[PDB]
Amino acid sequence: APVKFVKVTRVLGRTGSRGGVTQVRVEFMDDTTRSIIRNVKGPVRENDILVLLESEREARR
Amino acid sequence: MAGERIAEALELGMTDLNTIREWEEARQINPNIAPPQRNPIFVALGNIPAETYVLNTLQKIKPASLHDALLVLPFSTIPSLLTFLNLFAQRELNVPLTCRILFFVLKTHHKQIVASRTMRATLEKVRANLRAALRRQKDEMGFNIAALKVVSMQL
Amino acid sequence: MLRKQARQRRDYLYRRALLLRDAEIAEKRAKLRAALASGKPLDPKIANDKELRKDFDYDVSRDIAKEQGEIDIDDEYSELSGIVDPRVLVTTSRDPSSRLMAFSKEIRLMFPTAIRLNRGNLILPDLVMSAQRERLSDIILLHEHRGTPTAITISHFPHGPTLMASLHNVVLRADITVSESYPHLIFEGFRTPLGQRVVKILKHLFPPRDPTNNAKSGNRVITFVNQDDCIEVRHHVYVRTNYNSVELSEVGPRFTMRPFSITMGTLENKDADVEWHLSQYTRTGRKKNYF
Amino acid sequence: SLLPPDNEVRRKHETLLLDKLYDMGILSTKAKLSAVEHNVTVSAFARRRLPVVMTRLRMAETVQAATKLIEQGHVRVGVEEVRDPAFLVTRNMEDFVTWTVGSKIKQNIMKYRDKLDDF
Amino acid sequence: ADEKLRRDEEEIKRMWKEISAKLDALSSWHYKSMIAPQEVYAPSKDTAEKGEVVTKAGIPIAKQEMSREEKLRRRRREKERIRKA
Amino acid sequence: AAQAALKLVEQEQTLENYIHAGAYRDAIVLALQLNHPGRLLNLFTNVVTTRNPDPDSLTGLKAVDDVLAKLSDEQIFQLLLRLRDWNTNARTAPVAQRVLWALFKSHPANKLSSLSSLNEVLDAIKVYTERHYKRIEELVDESYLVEYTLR
Amino acid sequence: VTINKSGEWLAFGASKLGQLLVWEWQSESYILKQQGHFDAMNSLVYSPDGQRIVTAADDGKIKVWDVESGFCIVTFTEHTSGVTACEFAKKGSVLFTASLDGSVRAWDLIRYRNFRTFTAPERLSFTCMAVDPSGEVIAAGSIDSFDIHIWSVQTGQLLDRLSGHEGPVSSLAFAPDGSVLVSGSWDRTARIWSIFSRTQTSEPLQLQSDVLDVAFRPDSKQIAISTLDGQLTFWSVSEAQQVSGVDGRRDVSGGRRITDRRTAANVAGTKNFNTIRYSMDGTCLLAGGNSKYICLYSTTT
RNA sequence: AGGAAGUA
RNA sequence: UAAGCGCAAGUCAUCAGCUUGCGUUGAUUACGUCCCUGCCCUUUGUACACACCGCCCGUCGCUACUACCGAU
C-alpha cells in the first residue's frame, strides 16, 4: 500500500451528501495532472494537501 | 442526483451509439436481418436519438446548478460528454448550450485534456462541428441583419 | 450611539410631557370645533379665549386627522409599527436548569423571529448593550423556582416599556414537531387603556402580516385572554376542516401569566417611572382588574 | 393654515414641515402647527447654533468660552474640525460633537479625571 | 373653485421646495439613451388579436390546435394563479 | 356556411394525418391556410431538425425554399408577423432566423417592401435578431478557447 | 467671448459655473458645450478598461469623463442634493452610485439610463457605498442610521440590514474576491462581514480611533484602514490580525488655512487620510486627506 | 322540477 | 458558550427545602450541508437592464351554451 500525496482544487458544493462528509476535487501531487474527486470527512478547504490510500475508488453518493 | 442523471443518461446514450455503430457496420456488410434491439427507455419516448435524449435531460437541469451537476462529472465520463457535444455541434442542437457547457468542461479540465491525446482527436472533431455550426448560424444572422437594414432603409 | 439613545429617551419623555401640557387646550379646541359644527351653545371662556381661535385655525386639521383616524399616536411602537420584523431574544436566569432551558426552547419555539442565547455569565447592561447594538427589537427574560418557571420579563429597545410578570399553571411539552408560520394573535378581555398598553406590547412582539389573506392563510394560533388581570396564552395548531368547522390541537406550553409591573424604560432602568404595579398591601387593591 | 383643513396637501405639508423643523431641532414637538405660528424664532435658530449647543451639552461653561474654543479649533462636529461659530447643529448632529484629536482641553479632562494615557 | 384650490396648492408646493432646500442648506445636508427590444415589442395579450393566445414562452399557440388536455391544463394553471393571487 | 365548416373539419382531418406522414410541404401550405400556427412553428422546427440536410439549400428540405419563393403577399407578411413573434424567444430564434433567412434570400427588397404596421414589424425583427447575433458572436470568441486547447 | 480667425466659431465662457462653449454661427449648432463641477467632488472611479473616470459631486450630477480628449462624455442628473459615492462592478457596464437624496442609483452605462434606484424604508441619506464584484449585492451605509443596508440587484428588494456597529459606518468595501464585506465605523471599529455562506457572521477589528477609510489589496488577503489619528494600518483578512501600520500624522499636514489662529503644524484636521487605495500591483498605497499632500506609501517595507 | 353527458 | 468556584442580596408577583445578581478560571468540537428528520416558500404579481429561463401537473367544484334518459 504505497502512500500517494494529493491536493485540493474545488470543494463540490451542491453534491455532498450523508452528513459532514465533504466531497472534494483532487489534483494529484507527484504527477500534477491526474485529478479524481474524493470523499473527505472533516473540515477541508481549497489548497489543502490530503493523504489518500489506494486510488482505485470511483464512487460517490 | 442531477450529475447522476447526466452520468447514467450519458452512459445509456453511449451504449445506444455502440448499438447503432455495430448495426451500422452490419448494414455496411449486408441488408440482412440485423435487429438493433434498442433500450426500453428510448422506445418509451419513441425511437428517439441519443442527441435529443441527452439534450433534453441536459435541459431538465436548471442553469443555476448546471455547473454543479456538470462540475461533479468525473474524468471517466468526460469523453462521452465530448462525444455528445460532437453530435450536438454536428446536427446543431442548442449551440449556446453546447458552447456554454463545453467551455465549462474544458475550462476546468485543461491539464487533463491538454495532457491527454485521444480527446484532442475528438476535440478536433468537436472543434470542426462547433466552428462550422457557429460560423453558419452567424453568417445567416448577419445576412438577416443586413437585409432588415436594406428594407428598413428602403421604406 | 449611547448619546443618541439617551437623547432619544429624553426628547421622547419631553414630548410626552408636552402632551400632558396640551391636554386641556386639546379638549377646549375640540369643543370649539364641535360647537362650531353642531349647534349654538358654546362656553363663554372658550368663545372669549383669543389665543385659542388663532391656534385653533392653525391646528384644526390634525384633530380632524385624529377623529378620522389618519395620524399615528407617538409611542415606543408606532415609529416602526408593522414594517420591520421584530427580532426577539429569549434568555434565562444566571444558572438555568434542565426544565428551564427546555422551557426556553419551547418559548423561542413559540415566537418565529426569536433567537435564543445561552446565559453563561452575562452582565445585564451587556444584555441591553448587546441587544442595543445588534438590534434585537425585544428581549424576554426567564426565571425559575426549581426549573418550573415563575417569571418572565419582556423588555424591548431602545427604551421601550418592559413588563414584569409572574408565572403560574405551566405545563410543558408532553410526550410526542411544531410549524413556524407567522402566527394568529387573539386578545380577549383587554377593555381598559392599561389592557390596551399590554395588548400593544404583546402584538408588536410578533412578526407582522401582509394584509391580503391573513384571515384564511395560516394554521397556527396564539391566544391571550384575561380573567381577573391574570392573562392566559395557549398555543394551538388548527386545520379548518369545513367552511363552518375547525379542528384545534394543543401544540405547546399551557400558559398563564400574572403581570405585576409595567415599567417604561428598559431592563436596566430600575429607577425609571413605572406606569403600573400590583397594588397589594393597599386595602381595596384586590377588588380591581385594571387601574 | 389658510387651506381648507381637510386637504391632503395640507395633511402632508404639515407633517413634512413639522418633522423637518423638529428633526432640524428648532421646534421641540412635532404635533402643533401653532408651534410654527409663534414658536419658530431667530432666537431658536441662534440657540441651535454650535457654541450654545455645546454650552448646553456642557462642553464649556459659557457661550463666550465655547466660542473662543471653537475659534481656536478644539471642537469637531462628526469628523471635521469646525471653526465656524455660526455652524447650525441639527438634532442628531448634537450627538457627534466632541473635542478634536490632539486636544489640550481633552488632556485637561482626562488629566482632571486622573485617567490619561500618553499612547 | 377648484382652480383656486389647485392654484393655491401649486403655490404652496413651490414654497415648500424653496424653503425645504434652504433648511437642508442650513443643516449642511444632515436632513432625511435608447430602448430595449422588450420595450419596443414584447408578445402579449394586447399584442395578439387572435383566436390563438400568446403564451409565457412568447409563442402564439392556437386553441383550435389545443386539444381537451391542453385547454384543461391552462384552465388549471390560470386557476392556480387565482388561488395564489 | 355549413359546407365551409365541413371543409374546415375535412382539411383538419387531412393535416393531422399529414403531419403523421413524413411530408411537410402541404402542412406548411395547409397550415398557412388553416392559420393555427403553433404547429407551423413545429413544422419549421421539424424541418430544420431533420437528419437529412441536403442540398445546398435554404431551409433544409428541397420544396420549402421555393414554396417560400412561391408564397403570396398576405401570406408572407403574415409570416413576418409570426416571425416577429418567434424571433423574440431565444429557444426558437435559431429555427426562425433560418426560415427568415430563406425568406430574405428569396424575395427582393421591393416584394418585401410591398404594402398590403410594417415599420415596427421589421424593426422588431431587426432588434431581436441583433440581440441573438451579439450572443452567438460572443460564443465564437469563446470557441477560440478550443482553438487554443489543441496547441 | 473670443472669436475664430476664420470667423466661423465663437467661444463663450460663463465664469460662475464651468460653462465653456463653442458655437458655429451659421450652422447654428454647439460644437462644444462643456461644464465642470460647481461644487466639491466626493468620489471618482475608473472603468476596468481604464479609459474613462467617473466623478460625483455636491452639485448633484454624476458625470463621466474621458481620460483622453478632456471632455465629459455623459452627465447624469437624476439625483438631487449632492452625490456621495460612486463605483463600478467587475464588468464596467453598470455605474452604482449613492447620494444624500437617500438613494443608490444603479446606472446602465451602455444605455445611459438607470436600472434601479434603491432606497431605505425609513428615509436615510447614504454616505457610503460598496457593490459586490459579481454585482448582484449592494451594501450602503449612512450617518443618520448606523446599521448597514444590503439590497439585491437581480431581485430589486432589500436583502438585509446588518447590525454590530455603535456609530455611523463610514467606509464600506467588498473584497475583489467577493466573499467578505468590510465595514469601518465611528465606533472606532472595523468589521469582517462574512455574508455569502450559511453563517452571516461578523469579526470585529477593535481600532484606536474613528475609522475614516478602508481599502482592499487587489488580492483579497490584506486590507488597510485609515483612522482619524492620521494612522494607516494593515490587516490580514483570512486570519484577522494586524500585520503592519504607518503613523502618517506628520507626513500629511498641509498647514494653515485662513481662519486658523493656530499654527500650521498644530491643526488637527489636516492630519488624517480621508481616502486610501492600493495600486494594481498591490505594492504602494495612495493616501490623502483634507490637506495639501498626497501620500504614497508601500506595503512590504 | 330531477338523472346522467359534452364542449367553452 | 459548556464546565468549575466562591461572594453578596432578598426589592408589593415568585423565591429561603431557595431565588436572583456579581465577579474569578475557562476548553474540546462543529461553524459545512440539506443526504436523514422536518419546517417555511416558490410555478401570480411588486420598476427597467446588459444576462438568463421558456408555456409545471392531477382530482373535483361554480357558471355558460348544446343535446339527451324517465315520471307530470
PDB file of C-alpha atoms in Angstrom, chain E:
ATOM      1  CA  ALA E   1     -63.428  76.936  -7.105  1.00  0.00           C
ATOM      2  CA  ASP E   2     -61.099  74.019  -7.822  1.00  0.00           C
ATOM      3  CA  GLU E   3     -58.947  76.340  -9.928  1.00  0.00           C
ATOM      4  CA  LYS E   4     -58.380  78.410  -6.788  1.00  0.00           C
ATOM      5  CA  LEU E   5     -57.750  75.325  -4.651  1.00  0.00           C
ATOM      6  CA  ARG E   6     -55.250  73.894  -7.106  1.00  0.00           C
ATOM      7  CA  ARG E   7     -53.566  77.245  -7.776  1.00  0.00           C
ATOM      8  CA  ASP E   8     -53.129  77.596  -4.008  1.00  0.00           C
ATOM      9  CA  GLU E   9     -51.824  74.017  -3.784  1.00  0.00           C
ATOM     10  CA  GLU E  10     -49.227  74.549  -6.522  1.00  0.00           C
ATOM     11  CA  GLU E  11     -48.058  77.806  -4.941  1.00  0.00           C
ATOM     12  CA  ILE E  12     -47.701  76.019  -1.603  1.00  0.00           C
ATOM     13  CA  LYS E  13     -45.637  73.262  -3.267  1.00  0.00           C
ATOM     14  CA  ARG E  14     -43.344  75.893  -4.803  1.00  0.00           C
ATOM     15  CA  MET E  15     -42.955  77.474  -1.356  1.00  0.00           C
ATOM     16  CA  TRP E  16     -42.098  74.148   0.233  1.00  0.00           C
ATOM     17  CA  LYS E  17     -39.438  73.297  -2.330  1.00  0.00           C
ATOM     18  CA  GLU E  18     -37.719  76.672  -1.834  1.00  0.00           C
ATOM     19  CA  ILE E  19     -37.975  76.645   1.963  1.00  0.00           C
ATOM     20  CA  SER E  20     -37.083  72.959   2.370  1.00  0.00           C
ATOM     21  CA  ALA E  21     -33.977  73.438   0.232  1.00  0.00           C
ATOM     22  CA  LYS E  22     -32.943  76.396   2.404  1.00  0.00           C
ATOM     23  CA  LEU E  23     -33.466  74.337   5.554  1.00  0.00           C
ATOM     24  CA  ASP E  24     -31.325  71.441   4.326  1.00  0.00           C
ATOM     25  CA  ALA E  25     -28.678  74.011   3.374  1.00  0.00           C
ATOM     26  CA  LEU E  26     -28.741  75.461   6.905  1.00  0.00           C
ATOM     27  CA  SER E  27     -28.362  71.993   8.377  1.00  0.00           C
ATOM     28  CA  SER E  28     -25.481  71.438   5.890  1.00  0.00           C
ATOM     29  CA  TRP E  29     -27.169  68.380   4.381  1.00  0.00           C
ATOM     30  CA  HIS E  30     -27.944  66.426   7.541  1.00  0.00           C
ATOM     31  CA  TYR E  31     -31.629  66.064   6.667  1.00  0.00           C
ATOM     32  CA  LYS E  32     -33.686  62.954   5.803  1.00  0.00           C
ATOM     33  CA  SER E  33     -30.368  56.643 -24.382  1.00  0.00           C
ATOM     34  CA  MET E  34     -32.303  54.135 -26.404  1.00  0.00           C
ATOM     35  CA  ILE E  35     -34.878  51.464 -25.724  1.00  0.00           C
ATOM     36  CA  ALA E  36     -34.726  47.726 -25.075  1.00  0.00           C
ATOM     37  CA  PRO E  37     -36.283  45.219 -27.501  1.00  0.00           C
ATOM     38  CA  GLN E  38     -38.701  44.131 -24.772  1.00  0.00           C
ATOM     39  CA  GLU E  39     -39.817  47.760 -24.594  1.00  0.00           C
ATOM     40  CA  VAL E  40     -40.089  48.125 -28.362  1.00  0.00           C
ATOM     41  CA  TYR E  41     -42.128  44.927 -28.739  1.00  0.00           C
ATOM     42  CA  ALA E  42     -42.969  42.117 -26.318  1.00  0.00           C
ATOM     43  CA  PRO E  43     -45.561  39.466 -27.270  1.00  0.00           C
ATOM     44  CA  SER E  44     -48.635  39.566 -25.046  1.00  0.00           C
ATOM     45  CA  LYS E  45     -52.437  39.634 -24.933  1.00  0.00           C
ATOM     46  CA  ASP E  46     -52.684  43.275 -26.015  1.00  0.00           C
ATOM     47  CA  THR E  47     -50.303  42.498 -28.887  1.00  0.00           C
ATOM     48  CA  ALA E  48     -52.230  39.435 -30.142  1.00  0.00           C
ATOM     49  CA  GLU E  49     -55.690  39.926 -31.674  1.00  0.00           C
ATOM     50  CA  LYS E  50     -56.244  36.235 -32.228  1.00  0.00           C
ATOM     51  CA  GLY E  51     -58.161  33.088 -31.666  1.00  0.00           C
ATOM     52  CA  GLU E  52     -54.706  31.948 -30.612  1.00  0.00           C
ATOM     53  CA  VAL E  53     -53.094  33.083 -27.358  1.00  0.00           C
ATOM     54  CA  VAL E  54     -49.550  34.338 -26.803  1.00  0.00           C
ATOM     55  CA  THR E  55     -48.058  32.059 -24.160  1.00  0.00           C
ATOM     56  CA  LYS E  56     -45.470  32.789 -21.476  1.00  0.00           C
ATOM     57  CA  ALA E  57     -42.914  31.370 -23.908  1.00  0.00           C
ATOM     58  CA  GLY E  58     -43.764  34.321 -26.182  1.00  0.00           C
ATOM     59  CA  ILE E  59     -45.096  31.929 -28.830  1.00  0.00           C
ATOM     60  CA  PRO E  60     -48.711  32.073 -30.087  1.00  0.00           C
ATOM     61  CA  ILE E  61     -50.380  28.659 -29.777  1.00  0.00           C
ATOM     62  CA  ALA E  62     -53.913  28.382 -31.106  1.00  0.00           C
ATOM     63  CA  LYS E  63     -56.912  26.964 -29.252  1.00  0.00           C
ATOM     64  CA  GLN E  64     -58.152  25.140 -32.341  1.00  0.00           C
ATOM     65  CA  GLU E  65     -54.872  23.244 -32.216  1.00  0.00           C
ATOM     66  CA  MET E  66     -55.270  22.923 -28.457  1.00  0.00           C
ATOM     67  CA  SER E  67     -56.936  19.666 -27.539  1.00  0.00           C
ATOM     68  CA  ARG E  68     -59.021  18.760 -24.497  1.00  0.00           C
ATOM     69  CA  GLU E  69     -55.933  18.233 -22.359  1.00  0.00           C
ATOM     70  CA  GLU E  70     -54.093  21.474 -23.079  1.00  0.00           C
ATOM     71  CA  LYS E  71     -57.123  23.714 -22.602  1.00  0.00           C
ATOM     72  CA  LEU E  72     -57.754  21.705 -19.416  1.00  0.00           C
ATOM     73  CA  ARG E  73     -54.182  22.327 -18.212  1.00  0.00           C
ATOM     74  CA  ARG E  74     -54.391  26.030 -18.984  1.00  0.00           C
ATOM     75  CA  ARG E  75     -57.630  26.245 -17.002  1.00  0.00           C
ATOM     76  CA  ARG E  76     -55.951  24.568 -14.032  1.00  0.00           C
ATOM     77  CA  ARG E  77     -52.851  26.743 -14.445  1.00  0.00           C
ATOM     78  CA  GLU E  78     -54.747  30.034 -14.519  1.00  0.00           C
ATOM     79  CA  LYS E  79     -56.838  28.820 -11.579  1.00  0.00           C
ATOM     80  CA  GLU E  80     -53.567  28.077  -9.798  1.00  0.00           C
ATOM     81  CA  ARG E  81     -52.746  31.762 -10.405  1.00  0.00           C
ATOM     82  CA  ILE E  82     -56.157  32.685  -8.959  1.00  0.00           C
ATOM     83  CA  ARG E  83     -55.576  30.593  -5.822  1.00  0.00           C
ATOM     84  CA  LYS E  84     -52.216  32.334  -5.422  1.00  0.00           C
ATOM     85  CA  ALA E  85     -53.242  35.912  -6.271  1.00  0.00           C
TER      86      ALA E  85
END
